[PDB]
Subunit: 149 residues, 3 copies
């Protein structure tokens, strides 16, 4: 039983030119790229993405940092929602475990390179927000017999 | 005092073509390759390898997964038996620490890329099962003065 | 608010020829190289570097191991003193976390590749010991807006 999660490379990942390295970490585990799109995030879409934080004092500055190119992604794998969160590490890079993306690349939570859905409900909501269903692709990895039990 | 451990790249490691990356992780610590052999594991040798699991319901499926090309290896280093296990990570890739082989490469316990001896006694037995004494090579690493106290 | 830490690649790092890999790990987090110098460490400077250990039985052998080529470095970043220590890992490589320098490269505490200041006071003392003020270079990283909050 595989699932799908929404992962988004933030403008710092684009500008620091580590997109390929990020994607490689997920491919390395045999996670399948089900969707991928470069866009420029705008305030209106970011307000929906961060709807839970509406009205909080940090939100305007967060939206400013996130207004920029982003890489929208859907990855598929066993337990991939929780596993992608583990691979990213703590939101605060100083707290993140060695070997996680945030510990390996970042210093502060406001520039922490990447977002991943925190739950199945948020993955469904985020995938619907950032992608049209047409953009989710169905295919099977040829190495499946050696990735899955 | 150094010791020697038995490490085996399972068919998923061969088929996903990550053999070199696996070997590089052990070489990076100054562990010495004392033996290395590509073979195809067969049910009869795997029954002996997995002797501790005789009679258990999961043994037949385990032997099927492991029937295939494998890379038999012996690495030498300080505390290398326990350290190689730490480097491999937990049996379940989803529980393994980031930076371990299983966390970085795998999704499920039944395709977890690599075996390593779990104790001094199992290392001695496994090395003897998969290698004849004439296959174990003794030489000194030129950087020994900078690897060992 | 950034700080500066003193990091020194020990003779084993030089001789194993992993200087570039070590530097890349710190650059990867957006830490700024503020100073760098190759020298051959002398007993006189090492006695002051290891002043905390004066009179201990292991000091003479520690100085001997360190009398060789070293790369003196200053890196700047948020919380970089504590963070560099976390990236180095435990003094004993066998106790260090996977993904740390010592766990990934080393076997024994007496050859553990790198030194880093352990506190604000130690960083200030060690930077002043190994570098003259004119050797500390002040410049701004062009990617600062994407590294810092």
């Amino acid at each position: 039983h595989v699932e799908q999660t929404y992962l988004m490379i933030k403008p710092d990942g684009i500008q620091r030119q580590v997109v390929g390295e990020i994607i490689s970490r997920f491919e390395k585990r045999g996670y399948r790229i089900a969707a991928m799109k470069l866009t420029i995030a705008t305030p209106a879409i970011l307000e929906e993405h961060y709807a839970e934080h509406k009205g909080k004092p940090f939100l305007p500055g967060l939206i400013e940092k996130m207004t920029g190119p982003v890489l929208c992604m859907v990855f598929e794998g066993v337990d991939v929602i929780a596993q992608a969160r583990k691979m990213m590490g703590s939101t605060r890079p100083g707290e993140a475990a060695p070997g996680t993306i945030r510990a390996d690349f970042c210093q502060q939570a406001g520039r922490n390179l990447i977002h991943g859905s925190d739950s199945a409900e948020s993955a469904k909501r985020e995938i619907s927000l950032w992608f049209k269903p047409e953009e989710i692709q169905s295919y099977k990895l040829a190495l499946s017999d050696y990735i899955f039990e």
